[model samples]
Target: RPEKWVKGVCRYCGTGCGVLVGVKDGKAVAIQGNPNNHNAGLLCLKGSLLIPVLNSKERVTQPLVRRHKGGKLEPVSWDEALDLMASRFRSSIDMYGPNSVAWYGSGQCLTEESYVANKIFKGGFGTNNVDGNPRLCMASAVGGYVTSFGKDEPMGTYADIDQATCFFIIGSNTSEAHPVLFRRIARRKQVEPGVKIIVADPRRTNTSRIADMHVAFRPGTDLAFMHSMAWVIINEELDNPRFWQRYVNFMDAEGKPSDFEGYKAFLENYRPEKVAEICRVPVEQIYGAARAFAESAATMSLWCMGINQRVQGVFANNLIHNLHLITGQICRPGATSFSLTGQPNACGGVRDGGALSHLLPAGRAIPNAKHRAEMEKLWGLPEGRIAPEPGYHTVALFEALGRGDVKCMIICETNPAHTLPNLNKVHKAMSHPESFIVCIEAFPDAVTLEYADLVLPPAFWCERDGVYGCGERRYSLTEKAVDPPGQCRPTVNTLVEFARRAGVDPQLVNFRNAEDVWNEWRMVSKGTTYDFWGMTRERLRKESGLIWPCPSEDHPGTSLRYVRGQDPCVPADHPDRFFFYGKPDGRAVIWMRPAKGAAEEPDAEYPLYLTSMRVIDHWHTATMTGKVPELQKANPIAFVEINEEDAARTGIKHGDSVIVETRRDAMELPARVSDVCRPGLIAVPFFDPKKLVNKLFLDATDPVSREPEYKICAARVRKA
Candidate 1:
């Protein structure tokens, strides 16, 4: 038997389910759900089988470097590897300027690790070229929240799942993507049959199994569908006037201020009857969903990548929030607009830390002079040390790599070669001989390693201690349960050491460990709306998790942000019950964004829509989860799922190889004819390394959010 259980969080999804790692003989041998946390002693399949990832033989146990242009990776010492990495990055900057070099980080990194990278890149390197994998999945959500709520992050916690009288699930396959949260929602329906559940998606996936109404619409028509819903709410007199008049502002697409009557006039073109044909969803269903949403005692909205990975993803998020805000269903228990996260630390480590290309720490913008000065003074840096302009976003950064604009890039903990939209283009960029690439990773088998010039082995999950804030705004500590294998090191200390090697002043970082970085970040967040001073290292070690806006050590963490009593940032004595302090007017915006379509809608040659997503048994790119025997056995290769009606019409049968062709590229995968996808839409899982489906997808991104529209691209699938 193990000595004891070490409190930790799951390294997989954004659900951040609390787990206990059972250590025996200095090795993690068991995994169990933490009853003390939100999961209540229940572990998912991937979480339960995570031990194989630690024990996998494919782990990169040492530093590796390519001596020549076309040579293979060879083992090297840690100092030798980091020294070479620093020299390349520094020399690249010297020759091509700071814009020629960049660092592409990941959402799975710890908050301390992300904070140190942001500080070093922005403060020391004097460039804003610090972007990450979160740009792919979470950027749209961030843009939406900032544009609508005047800040970022969801307003509601996971506890709202139980208290909500109605659940509006759109664009997410929660049953497979977020299993634990799905179970909780399913239980709520089981316990209270009157609690309505509405699921909207192009594909009728497993998440619709428990839905009272499964509303399927045309792919990439969410913006139109949302507008139609709003039109119905107003047309049927279900709209709440008291809320919009007091706490909400109507803003036009040009960002001009408007009134409720102006909003009604803007939505005139999107009547339910007119939008029904455009969205390919019934008009009555739109009316039904609107009434259900507004009439419920308390309603909760949940969404994920399907809405986020689009050209109008930010607009879709705004409309989701507009529904809640206009109906007075926000800033209270069980009534909120909540966005589900894709990665474990995408929320805490990247978004809250402001490690993205266009942000500063704790909800601050990069271009804002005040925010820059605040961060600079706090970090003991001189005036004008930080850059004025933001860096390249994910898609643009990779494009710059291929164009020889960015000569060197260091990627951490993400496999962009498999996940990035348009794999053929990104693959060509990754192979640019003039550009150098460095990767910090645990497993040697990830597809991103294919183009690596230098590779550094980092400590895997549970081997190094750090904090991960989940989708619900809860920051949880993942305690170190075992020593790192071989010469592997944690990325947190590795980043600090690299900064010194790269000629950065040691005083700028002074952090010895993750705890030191956390302490400094805590001080920086103390006065901001993301205040976390109450969550000291000692408190975090004792508690399972704590939400942000925790101002004092004695005070409990806030549950509902922007609400006078629940949020500490809003003065307790303040008059307004719902204070949107982020805005100048102290009110949220109901944007008058028109219905927009995909960047690459279906054309004559390519008459079907192609989309890609995760598979429950196998995680993204299957880097860690692939180590498990069962997960690999279940989903070893990528396959395209076509609706039964489409399969018969196209003469494709189950288990037959099909060629899915697009403007970007083409791939052949086995077909599984099922009733999952709608007639004109087909879905593929990107987890399999054998066949990267992103090769057949487009790289078109949302202009505002910079998140690629991987969810919708024109394609045609034929029997191969």
Candidate 2:
């Protein structure tokens, strides 16, 4: 029998391209792109092949429990699994206080499911130790936007691809990480020959293969390069003074408004020669990049993990935004500093306030007193219903778990044991007998079920009706396209069941089903930043989905914001034309950021710099995607990409198994010797659990963002 096709988004990465999945006999069989989707009917390798992964051997068909004494996982009834989780969670909280239990979710979950997590952890149970995988991928981007722009998401949408005359991609290997988007840019370049593409990276990856110009800066030197570009724009008088007067903001060293004169004075400190040695790119090239950006009628900048995983990730992001504002290239369609989200809802779910620690919904911040009060009133609780003190981030949470500070953990749609920067330590943390673990997942794998005290099987996307907010603020709907296999249910429904078991008040925990949870979440956003109260479940089901800030039934969603050049909230008494609504002075901050060196420099023992990333064939951890034989066979095991010179020096040949070792640990994997990577930097992917990449990665994270340093690590290779 032929499988019926259904429209959906690829659940793997944040590209959120529309996909057509073919289901047969209650199983996914084939996958393609929905031509109607904005992705130009193109599917990346991972998206095209993810259907087979749905049926991988690792699928958790039944609930499970860990035997008390032996600590071995055994199949159990749904009743037993849920009962165990409820009892353990309830008893632990009773003994250790509600703060002792924490929930860690993922950026991969749907927006509706993520919102329910926020309500359960913060509203019903009342604790702040909630975090998500966004803490790993894009927390730095979040931090930068909040500190500078007073917002958390990109100001530009995907339509900017066509409007942009210059595209500056820094720190991201889009060819591999987000292949479809890169292909679209390439196609656009073919059509619009005038568009200039600049690729900034440490290694010469395939993304630079088509770059109009590639700037191979030293790793971790992003701040220096970005700041230099600003200086160049200022020196050549390529900046848009009119745009600056109307919509831009800048602050001096003392945190006072730079206005126009103050900003010009600050640029004097960042001379081209000052940053040239640190960034290693020629001053002329920097000048050319600036000229291209300023002269271009419109520009769009896209960046991902490369810049987000740094110690100064926030600074780097802010610097990029500074360039956009300086050139007056933003707030218009396809002309903004667009930060590409790395997971399904890293932007929609996590940034929209789905994580554990935050109280406000999308576009609202926890630090705002008014926002917190509004949320409390909506929750029908006393003032300060949510914690004023934010919880520990992802890396910190794992460290707390290791130190036995966190006694109970409920994880939804994440596999941190394999994805965290330091895996060996995470294993030690999970090994604690005094701790209790509950994992809600669609599949059972070594990473989650191996350590989980209780396992709850949750329904897959096809079995749920909910809204998924993608990168462009595009609210895409995922209807109950198909039935969930077995006794599995949507995670929100499961959470409601558990919330009831935990004795949550019926009124506070009200939700007959997933749609009810959506209604409640929608209510909280009314008259707020992401207002969409006018949108009902019936409307979302009938229409595909609607962009946010639709506060009233008659209102149409706004695609581009701030382009009209003024905020209605600001009074005539204010001097500033553009309102920095997120901050006190209503202006963006310009940090005096200096260039920094890589965390780990290659030494005699570890003569090569090792960087791990994902391939087109797999997603994070590969617990789901690795199960499909076709996907697995396409790129079966983890491999190291070494420069030909390094390969010759190590006497290693292609297809040869090599042992790569770091100070922390070592793993043997096959090697592919190629010039694709720079001589000193070695690149690998993190999708393989068998050869855990996190084992070798350092635990160093940005102090402000708490995002780990997954891109830069020190290691050397030898033939196994």
Best by TM-score: 1
Candidate 2: worst-modelled 10 consecutive residues by lDDT: 563-572
> Candidates' lDDT values, in order?
0.89, 0.75
Candidate 2: where is the Cα deviation over 4 Å? 1-5, 20-32, 55-58, 252-270, 354-359, 367-369, 565-580, 584-586, 601-607, 649-653, 718-720
Put down candidate 2 lDDT per residue, 1-720, tens digits, no spaces: 335876667776677787767778766767777676667568877777776565544566678888762477788998777777788778877887677778898777777777777777776776777888888888889887777787667766777787788899998888888888888888778899988989988778788877888887767776777777888888778988787666666776666656667766666766778777666677776887778878888889999988898777887888888888777787776688899888877776777754746535756556677866777788776777677767667777777777888888988888888888878888888878778888887776647568888888777766676666777766666666567777778887788778778866567777777678777877877765566776786666555455665666666565565433322234446665455556655555555445565577678888777887767767777777666566667678788888898788768789899888998998898988887776677888888778888999988888788888888878978789
Model 1 TM-score (2 dp): 0.99
RMSD of 2: 2.9
Clashing pairs in 1: none
> For all the candidates, what are their Cα RMSDs to the real structure?
1.1, 2.9
Quick one: best lDDT, which candidate? Answer: 1
**For every model shown, what is its TM-score relative to the native structure?**
0.99, 0.93
